Structure 1
């Protein structure tokens, strides 16, 4: 048929998508080539981590739907993730469903 690298490498993520950048963007005369598979693997594993964290966060509220509110909740429960994007805030963040003693009555 046409022997593409996706089946040979066993990776669903696009391989030469980076090669597009490298070719048309003319970044250097010696850029990428091996870079695609590397970053693809890193992005895949980071996306797996984020998917696991979001799935764990969603089940806490006995609901099985994904909303960016829950992404903000999962990120803000992580101090390292907070330090990664400390100058960032995601919309609809609000406040957590656990209420402090300051607001509750005596």
Structure 2
């Protein structure tokens, strides 16, 4: 009989879905075939980036004495980090606002 099913995420030690990523790769017309390790690698990378942004955004939410992350905290996390700001340079965050920044010349004497 068939052995007990184990998700590929559990085999790879990931929280993100390896199976869904593989299916989306197959259905996206990216290539004729998809390797076994490609969805694992891609899911691991996506999980890492999500964890990075969530860590920074949780820090920003804590700085505001807030318990829940809102778009403002995601914007603050992204634009205060050089790497993420470079990755997401051309992206607009709805309800994210902007970083507070006044040019020094505009301040009073």
Give the structure-1-normalised TM-score. Answer: 0.72
CA contact (8 A) 2:78 2:84 kept: yes
Change (3 A) 1:18 1:57: same
Tell me the C-alpha RMSD between the 2 structures: 2.9
More strand per residue: 2
Distance in 1 separating the partners of 2:39 and 2:66 = 37
Q: Which has the higher contact order (CA 8 A, sep 6+)?
A: 2
CA contact (8 A) 1:22 1:32 kept: no
CA contact (8 A) 1:57 1:70 kept: yes
Distance in 1 separating the partners of 2:83 and 2:99 = 19
Offset, 1:42 = 0.9
| Map of 2:71 onto structure 1 | 68
For residues 70-89 of structure 1, give each alpha carbon's deviation from its aligned partner in whole angstroms, at most 9, with x where no partner exists. Answer: 11112121233222222222
Distance in 2 separating the partners of 1:63 and 1:80 = 25
Give the structure-2-normalised TM-score. Answer: 0.70
1:35 aligned to 24, 34, 38, which one? 38
CA contact (8 A) 2:72 2:96 kept: yes
Distance in 1 separating the partners of 2:39 and 2:16 = 10
Task: Indicate the larger mover: 11-20 or 33-42.
Answer: 11-20
Distance in 1 separating the partners of 2:31 and 2:14 = 27
Task: Indicate the larger mover: 89-98 or 68-77.
Answer: 89-98
